[PDB]
């Protein structure tokens, strides 16, 4: 049928959504899973375990605000599977947020996808969902990233132990 | 190789870790879709969503004690595929309180199972920690979720929409 | 005909649940009798008639709380009678103590059996319960008695009433 | 004989020991009805902590008077307490008009046990009974007696959705 | 002999807390002799110390609740010497902790064998007690203590004294 | 060998403060040993309990304040098993507090001994600080252990079990 309150809301815009949402629900599995590599009693980096614990959580919130949004404007709601992350060892700090790195670089990417589309479709009430609630956030975790990844880089890791430690001590805790 | 840790952890023991951890976060993932199925502008009962959206937060938390558990013992996490649900579209009020009833004695059986397993391999630590923060919680569950589906179908539920909307008002509201 | 909730949980273990819940009614009820024994104007003893009360209300507790574990799995209630006590006059502080050690011991064994058929039926939720409820309080409320009936005898009771006036005041007092 | 007692006929004695009895069979019955509404497939929180309530007060009620037996010199004399005549209370209308009844039969129990006292011209005791009992005993036979009335008028037991109702705004 | 208050207490359950009484002394021994060898002018690691006199101190109130436990059952305590440690000097921060781990893991192997024992024996209440009050205390100390190897080793320890120094500081202070 | 901060310090004096050590501890043992004595649940002098834990906690912390001493002036400590006291069962609460003054009076000779050793050395440091935290308080537990032994034997111990209850209460509580 039809939705007593869609409007303006293309076919094409509310398929996105729900490839948007899996997308979120996946970086919240990637996020999960590098928690707790840094759980392990032969890594035992809790800084870093709790850092991607946050992360993984505010992804799982951002998909469910594009939940509520796809039924806001009258779509509907198709789940898929999560798949499990690419890798199960994370090898190291240093390693893990240029993965991240990557991991939100690509999302950021499906998010100016999304934007191009309710552009195209004069769907300007999506456009200002998706930069008002996205954009400007990506671009922060983006330039989070880089600047772990710089500082790491510089302390000596991966290859100084020491470097992840105290990295782990003094700018994530 | 072998952890530093591990003692009396048996292989068995963490790969039905490994799989109660994926069980977990599909309890997650049902309860979430059904949170959303109430929040529909043609469905539009938000103490039912809000109801399966804590449901679907605590099963993730959960996931995240028993990733914790496997750490704690020495195993190593193997993340797999986390499944969409059966279905898209959950009907009611009464059948979603009807298949989240179903859901938790499936858990529960796998959670039994673990806890036998625990048993027939002398591990009293694994048995204990099933049993403080898993088997009483499941019975918990169970016994709330058969209330909600006893007052649901003596109020005439699902062919009253009023019984629907008064149970989500005075018991879930 | 089956409830809904009920899993895992044996005719045995029922059955014998109910027995349980009859077992600390009666124990309730001669808590209750020593209790206001204690009371009468040529005993006169207050705080060993408060101590037995007490006693009777932590027995109720126990019953209800066993009567919620037989809903909670799934079972049916069936009570019988309340036996009346086996004595209306008990004679002493002294004795009373020790008929109630009798009875504590008594009603642990009675435990004991139902912790061994939880066991024998793999119902570690029911097992588990009896341990976390029942058990160690069974072992501290048999470890008080006999530290009382050990002050009593050591004092000079029954013979001697300054003992057990002294006893009630600056132990049960 | 007690060093206490006076103008404590025996009979009287028998009725209060009686009386005690039956109160913990009240209390017992109550219980009853309390977690027979806890079940998983009858599920009314409000019917059961009502009933459990009440159970508890007739628990307090026999406390009472074995306190008064003792108090007047009298011997408590414990005999067993019979169990509920049911195990299956039906619905909230069925347990309230049970309770109604069964709080009549309690009421007529003390009537007669205030008549023995002032015929054995025994003030304090009927005084007693008129203080701790009487009243307490006519305003729970209103008060189950308008239950029963707002639940028969709602549609009960017929109508589950009226016990629902009836558990959650009035009970509640 | 026989208490008053003892019943279901075997004698080698008995035996096996004097026992074990013993080990947590002697790991309360060692762990005193750890702390003040951090104490030294010639090695000076004043959270090492703190943390392994906080590790002797906790050793020693287990050891008190076993011997409550012991007096709670009916079982009669009898003391055996207490053996020094098997060093004086405990060379470096990372060999102590290793030494650390090697300890906990032999107490949790003698824990392991109790609650067997208790489980041979039809003893309930002593299963549980060990499961309740040291099987996850000891899987949470050998965690930790997993953790602060992991971490020694990788900052570089105990051949850089930079390492055992700042470790001292930001995760033992 | 040789400390950076000894100074004045005697190979004698440093012997004589590792059998202090070894004493100070045998005597938390004795201690110890004679608390969980009145905890049996035949005997159940509670107050008799607590009064000799505290005393064995206190001659621990005397032994870790003589190994802090040892430290200070760069000697090394060297540690001894902890003998198991002379009894088992300590009869009755005025034979433990005969027991207890014998073995004060012991130590005391022994750390006037110190003394002597620390004056005959040129020691002022040593012997200020046996002064300081040793004598007095030695003095002191001989008075206070003395005082109760009067007490006893004048309520008629141990023949008395009124006595030694009363004595428990208004005394020791
Ligand atoms: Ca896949
Ligand atoms: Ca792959
Ligand atoms: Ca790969
Ligand atoms: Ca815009
Ligand atoms: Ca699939
Ligand atoms: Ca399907
Ligand atoms: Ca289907
Ligand atoms: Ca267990
Ligand atoms: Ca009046
Ligand atoms: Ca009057
Ligand atoms: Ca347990
Ligand atoms: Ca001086
Ligand atoms: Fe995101
Ligand atoms: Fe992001
Ligand atoms: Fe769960
Ligand atoms: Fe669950
Ligand atoms: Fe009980
Ligand atoms: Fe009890
Ligand atoms: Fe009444
Ligand atoms: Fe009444
Ligand atoms: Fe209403
Ligand atoms: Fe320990
Ligand atoms: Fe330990
Ligand atoms: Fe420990
Ligand atoms: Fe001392
Ligand atoms: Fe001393
Ligand atoms: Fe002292």
């Not at 293309?10 to 629900?25: G, K, V």
């Not at 956030?137 to 302390?155: F, P, S, W, Y």
Request: proline share 2%.
């Amino acid at each position: 049928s039809t939705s007593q309150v869609r409007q303006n809301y293309h076919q094409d815009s509310e398929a996105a959504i729900n490839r948007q949402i899996n997308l979120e629900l996946y970086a919240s599995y990637v996020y999960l899973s590098m928690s707790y590599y840094f759980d392990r009693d032969d890594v035992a980096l809790k800084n870093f375990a709790k850092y991607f614990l946050h992360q993984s959580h505010e992804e799982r919130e951002h998909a469910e605000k594009l939940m509520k949004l796809q039924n806001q404007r009258g779509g509907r709601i198709f789940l898929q599977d999560i798949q499990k992350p690419d890798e199960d060892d994370w090898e190291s700090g240093l390693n893990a947020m240029e993965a991240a790195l990557h991991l939100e670089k690509n999302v950021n990417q499906s998010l100016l996808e999304l934007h191009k589309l309710a552009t195209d479709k004069n769907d300007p009430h999506l456009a200002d969902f998706i930069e008002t609630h996205y954009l400007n956030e990506q671009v922060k975790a983006i330039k989070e990233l880089g600047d772990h990844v710089t500082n790491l880089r510089c302390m000596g890791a991966p290859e100084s132990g020491l470097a992840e430690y105290l990295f782990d001590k003094h700018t994530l805790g």
